């Protein structure tokens, strides 16, 4: 199965991939919450500091690049956005390559690096839809099933892993528990309940299982009481946003129960992020769908099956042992 290391950057995990005849190196966010692959053009205008520390792409020096001429724009949940023009080229990832893959060459962005969106075609910022990277990996015979497994690995590990088309059965406990999707567009599953260090709360709503989000965002119906219980407090992050902070010097775990008996336990240290922000935030206040992000996902082994339209979950097992099978 093709597979890639995932490099912890702090807010995100990067995947390395090269583009074009001259194999121009990029490190881009591995994002299960979006569906388009895009790179930072060498001549782009970054809106916020240096968005060119994780590679750039110069279309003019790849003899295999072709612009498609159509414009690309996308907005993300954190209000960052990108503008560019679609093109196609050869892409190297996972120890393999795909030819004539559509991706955007971005000429202005407020994101800090490019993004490899590996989500469903329904969240592509395109009309008509097109074959994004997971679809092409299957179509070109690199994998038999449009599916991938995510192992962000422990806090402090340097590198996690994504396996395209395969599953490492050594890296979880119990059985993978398959969940159907509950969104028309996202890789989202039902969250049944949340027991945060003994304060238990009904949920019963969908959550996007999102590698491209740093922390986790849930409705006020859950978060309000927890903020009171844990001492989380709103402060301006300013201007006119605010987030919950928490004392950096604040035992136990938070358990997330899904359908079909799946339960993921997350140590409470995952909820103090260096001033420290709380690792729970409000999806209502931040104007995003509910999301379980990296602080959750480090504690799960997750199989995203885009053919079957399922997400399967099990408690992660941190181990060098490996037993990979095709999904």
């Amino acid at each position: 199965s093709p597979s890639s290391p995932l490099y912890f950057e702090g807010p995100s995990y990067g995947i390395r991939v090269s583009v074009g005849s001259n194999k121009q190196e990029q490190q881009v966010v591995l994002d299960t919450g979006s569906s388009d692959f895009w790179v930072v053009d060498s001549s782009a205008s970054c809106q916020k500091g240096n968005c060119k520390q994780y590679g750039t792409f110069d279309p003019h020096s790849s003899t295999s690049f072709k612009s498609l001429g159509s414009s690309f724009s996308i907005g993300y949940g954190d209000k960052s956005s990108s503008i560019g023009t679609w093109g196609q080229d050869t892409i190297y990832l996972g120890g393999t390559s795909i030819t004539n893959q559509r991706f955007a060459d971005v000429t202005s962005t407020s994101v800090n690096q490019g993004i490899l969106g590996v989500g469903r075609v329904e969240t592509e910022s395109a009309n008509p839809p097109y074959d994004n990277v997971p679809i092409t990996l299957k179509k070109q015979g690199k994998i038999k099933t449009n599916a991938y497994s995510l192992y962000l690995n422990s806090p402090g590990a340097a590198t996690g892993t994504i396996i395209f088309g395969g599953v490492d059965n050594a890296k979880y406990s119990g059985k993978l528990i398959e969940e159907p999707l509950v969104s028309d567009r996202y890789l989202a599953v039902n969250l049944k309940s949340l027991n945060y260090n003994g304060d238990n709360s009904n949920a019963g709503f969908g959550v996007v299982v999102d590698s491209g989000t740093t922390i986790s965002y849930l409705p006020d119906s859950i978060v309000d009481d927890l903020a009171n219980k844990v001492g989380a407090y709103l402060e301006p992050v300013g201007l006119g946003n605010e987030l919950y902070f928490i004392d950096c010097n604040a035992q136990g775990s938070a358990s997330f129960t899904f359908d079909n008996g799946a339960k993921i336990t997350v140590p409470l240290s995952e909820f103090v992020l260096q001033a420290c922000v709380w690792g729970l935030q409000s999806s209502d206040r931040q104007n995003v769908p509910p999301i379980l992000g990296d602080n959750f996902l480090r504690h799960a082994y997750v199989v995203f099956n885009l053919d079957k339209e399922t997400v399967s979950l099990a408690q992660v097992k941190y181990t060098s042992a490996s037993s990979v099978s095709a999904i």
Partner: peptide, 6 residues
């Protein structure tokens, strides 16, 4: 942090 598509 970041929160990745609408």
């Amino acid at each position: 942090x970041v929160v990745x598509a609408x």
